[PDB]
Amino acid sequence: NTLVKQLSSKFGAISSVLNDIFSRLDPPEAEVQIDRLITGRLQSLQTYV
Amino acid sequence: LSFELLHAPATVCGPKKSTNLVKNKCVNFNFNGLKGTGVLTESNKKFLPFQQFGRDIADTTDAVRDPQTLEILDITPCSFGGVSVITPGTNTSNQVAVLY
Amino acid sequence: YSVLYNLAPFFTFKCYGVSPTKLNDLCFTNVYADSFVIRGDEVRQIAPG
Numbered sequence: 782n783t784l785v786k787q788l789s790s791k792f793g794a795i796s797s798v799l800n801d802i803f804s805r806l807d808p809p810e811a812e813v814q815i816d817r818l819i820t821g822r823l824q825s826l827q828t829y830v
Numbered sequence: 831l832s833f834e835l836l837h838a839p840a841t842v843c844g845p846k847k848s849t850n851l852v853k854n855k856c857v858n859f860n861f862n863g864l865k866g867t868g869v870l871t872e873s874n875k876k877f878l879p880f881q882q883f884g885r886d887i888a889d890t891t892d893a894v895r896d897p898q899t900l901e902i903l904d905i906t907p908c909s910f911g912g913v914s915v916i917t918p919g920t921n922t923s924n925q926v927a928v929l930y
Numbered sequence: 931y932s933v934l935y936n937l938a939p940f941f942t943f944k945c946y947g948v949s950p951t952k953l954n955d956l957c958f959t960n961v962y963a964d965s966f967v968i969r970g971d972e973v974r975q976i977a978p979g
């Protein structure tokens with residue numbers, strides 16, 4: 782349940798939804814936003830393991 | 831210029847033409863600026879007139895309202911699963927079996 | 931928003947939160963337009979933070 786609920790954290794990004802970030806903003810900043818989200822989710826997975 | 835983005839009908843955007851509504855198959859959908867992939871089916875939820883879209887325990891959009899007709903559509907992902915390959919040694923045979 | 935580069939050469943066009951580049955695909959609830967007149971040295975004051 783904790784792993785599932787950790788998917789709504791923005792991790793310092795504009796949004797937690799990838800589609801909104803990709804459709805609302807340019808690739809130059811989309812890179813950093815998706816990097817932040819990906820790093821947060823990878824950290825969550827490693828902690829669970 | 832200040833733009834308002836809320837859980838509202840959101841009736842101000844560009845000249846994009848709409849297509850027909852097709853159900854019971856995994857498709858790409860763009861419901862009023864909201865993009866996604868999956869199969870849309872008739873929903874049996876008791877939506878209230880002021881409500882626009884639903885949500886699940888996993889905090890994701892799993893129900894939408896058609897911006898043309900007062901219809902609630904449930905969104906589910908298309909089929910998914912894992913595949914395992916059962917083999918003896920390659921020193922023995924090249925035949926395999928597959929478990930979905 | 932496609933027809934917006936049809937005036938005098940704009941000196942300031944800065945967009946926060948949405949990429950102006952061919953991104954009229956987003957649907958908004960309402961739009962607010964705030965128009966005023968300032969001096970050139972004060973234009974930089976109109977920005978977050």
Ligand SMILES: *[C@@H]1O[C@H](CO)[C@@H](O)[C@H](O)[C@H]1NC(C)=O
Nearest residue numbers: 839848896897898899900901
């Ligand atoms: C236009 O949109 C309104 C919104 O409720 C809807 O009732 C009506 O059926 C729509 N007309 C057509 C031709 O789709």
